[PDB]
């Protein structure tokens, strides 16, 4: 969907409507903690809206925004991101910041998660039809943006004590829940591309396509916010006693001169049993740029590990030329199974072929 960096436009309409939908649908028996956190969320409507548009303006964005796409049908290196994995990453960060009362930052992250959900609920994104593949990509989003006011909805159809919402709370595994919830909306979106929204179809078809995918984006966003309010009100932990199949690193590089690096970068772990795994951190684009925030996903060789089995974690640099760079990370977070399990301020130089321990 379109958005503008000042937190306006289609993306902003979707999250704003998301909150309003939820206010309308919330049943009488909702816990008081949930209503209070909803009030905190509304105190932070600006950041919700800003985060819902920011990813399109992020200087660190991938060149073709590859991670804003996801097809719902289709261990020595890091794994790339998709619209679906970003929803999960930003949701964990949001829950993490919420638990410590950092509500402005939490709500921004929440908004970012919702940017990615909103995208996978377009027709073009879950169909993988880019602006390069089709003139209709931009045309359709502009058509929707111009008409966004007429596609606003103010209820999901049902109160929060009813099926659509209670089904959202049934699965305490947030990540598994989110993936299949998003999957359902993205299949309807991809279906709408082929049935109504592509350049093969008519203006009436586009109108119907916008009506349905915008309604779905708003209803689905309401559901995510609902899940979020329950999660942070109960301190729900979605990772509890689950095998760590993979780790996600979220690394903020300092904005200081020459803080970034082009040297080889590795993330690594050592278990209680003395076993190690190391991966190179190397995303498609230009990693570890001064002031950027990079995301890496690492798949574990051993699929039967609990988080507490991971005793040590480090990052390690290796000079690419005869002149060792220096790299200065501001902070690194490590996420396992939907929970931030390490939040390490660094703010110090890693000079040549040095290792820095993050746990």
* C-beta closer to Zn ion: residue 84 or 119: 119
**Alpha-carbon distance 178 to 88, whole Å?**
7
Binding site feature residues = 1, 11, 56, 68, 115, 119, 125, 137, 141, 258, 260-262, 282-283, 285-287, 325-326
286's contact among Ca ion, Zn ion, none, with CB below 5 to 8 A by partner kind, is: Ca ion
Task: For the segment 147-186, give every residue that binds Zn ion (CB under 5 A).
Answer: none
Q: Is the dihedral of CA 48, 54, 55, 58 positive or negative?
A: negative
* C-beta closer to Ca ion: residue 262 or 343: 262
Phi, psi (rounded to 5 degrees) for 312? -120, 155
* C-beta closer to Ca ion: residue 131 or 289: 289
Q: Is 237 in the site for Ca ion (CB under 5 A)?
A: no
Q: Is 140 in the site for Zn ion (CB under 5 A)?
A: no
**Alpha-carbon distance 126 to 184, whole Å?**
11
Closest Cα partner for 4 from 68, 57, 47?
Answer: 57
Q: Which string of DSSP letters, residue by residue, matches 304-331? A: T--GGGEEEEEEEEE-SSSS---B-EEE
Closest Cα partner for 355 from 310, 313, 314, 311?
Answer: 314
* C-beta closer to Ca ion: residue 80 or 268: 80
Q: Is 282 in the site for Ca ion (CB under 5 A)?
A: yes
**Alpha-carbon distance 149 to 3, whole Å?**
14
250's contact among Ca ion, Zn ion, none, with CB below 5 to 8 A by partner kind, is: none
Question: From the list 27, 150, 286, 347, which residue makes contact with Ca ion (rule: CB under 5 A)?
Answer: 286
1's contact among Ca ion, Zn ion, none, with CB below 5 to 8 A by partner kind, is: Zn ion
174's contact among Ca ion, Zn ion, none, with CB below 5 to 8 A by partner kind, is: none
Element (H, E) at 175: helix 174-192
Question: From the list 25, 30, 119, 121, which residue makes contact with Zn ion (rule: CB under 5 A)?
Answer: 119
Q: Is 287 in the site for Zn ion (CB under 5 A)?
A: no
Q: Is 280 in the site for Ca ion (CB under 5 A)?
A: no
Instruction: Classify 336 as helix, strand or coil.
Output: strand
E strand residue ranges, the chain: 246-253, 264-271, 276-280, 293-299, 310-318, 329-336, 339-345, 355-357
CB of 338 to Zn ion, least distance (A): 24
User: Under rule CB under 5 A, how many of the chain's residues touch Zn ion?
Assistant: 2
Q: Is 200 in the site for Ca ion (CB under 5 A)?
A: no
Q: Please, which residues have CB within 8 angstroms of residue 89's CB and are 6 or more apart in sequence? A: 81, 113, 248, 250, 295, 335
Query: Which residue stretch of 159-167, 283-291, 315-323, 331-339 sits at the interface with Ca ion (rule: CB under 5 A)?
Result: 283-291
Q: Which residues pair with 340 in a beta bridge?
A: 335
Q: Is 1 in the site for Zn ion (CB under 5 A)?
A: yes
Q: Which residues are near Ca ion by CB under 5 A?
A: 262, 282, 286
List residues near Zn ion by CB under 5 A: 1, 119
């Amino acid at each position: 969907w379109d958005g503008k960096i000042d937190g306006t436009g289609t993306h902003a309409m979707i999250v704003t409507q998301g909150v309003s939908i939820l206010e309308n649908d919330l049943s009488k028996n909702e816990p008081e903690s949930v209503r209070k956190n909803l009030e905190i969320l509304k105190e932070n409507m600006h950041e919700l809206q800003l985060g819902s548009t920011y990813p399109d303006y992020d200087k660190n964005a991938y060149d073709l925004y590859q991670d804003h796409f996801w097809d719902p049908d289709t261990l020595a290196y890091s794994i790339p991101d998709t619209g679906e994995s970003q929803i999960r990453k930003f949701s964990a960060l949001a829950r993490y910041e919420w638990q410590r009362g950092n509500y402005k930052q939490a709500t921004f992250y929440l908004g970012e998660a919702m940017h990615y959900f909103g995208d996978i609920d377009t027709p073009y994104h879950p169909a993988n039809v880019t602006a390069v593949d089709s003139a209709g990509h931009v045309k359709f989003e502009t058509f929707a943006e111009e008409r966004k006011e007429q596609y606003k909805i103010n209820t999901a159809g049902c109160k929060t004590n009813e099926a659509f919402y209670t089904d959202i709370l049934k699965n305490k595994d947030f990540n598994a829940w989110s993936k299949e919830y998003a999957r359902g909306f993205a299949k309807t979106g991809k279906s709408i591309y082929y049935s109504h929204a592509s350049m093969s179809h008519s203006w009436d078809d586009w109108d119907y396509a916008a009506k349905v995918t915008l309604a779905n984006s708003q209803k689905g966003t309401a559901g995510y916010i609902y899940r979020f309010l329950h999660d942070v009100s109960e301190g729900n932990d979605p990772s509890v006693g689950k095998n760590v199949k993979e780790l996600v690193a979220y690394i903020s590089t300092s904005g200081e001169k020459d803080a970034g690096t082009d040297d080889y970068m590795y993330f690594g772990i050592k278990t209680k049993d003395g076993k190690t795994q190391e991966w190179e951190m190397d995303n498609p684009g230009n990693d570890f740029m001064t002031g950027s925030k990079d995301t890496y996903t690492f798949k574990l060789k051993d699929e039967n590990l609990k988080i507490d089995d991971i005793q040590n974690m480090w990052i390690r640099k290796r000079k690419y030329t005869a002149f060792s760079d220096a790299y200065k990370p501001e902070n690194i977070k490590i996420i396992a199974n939907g929970k931030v399990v390490v939040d390490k301020d660094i703010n110090e130089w890693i000079s040549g072929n040095s290792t820095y321990n993050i746990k």
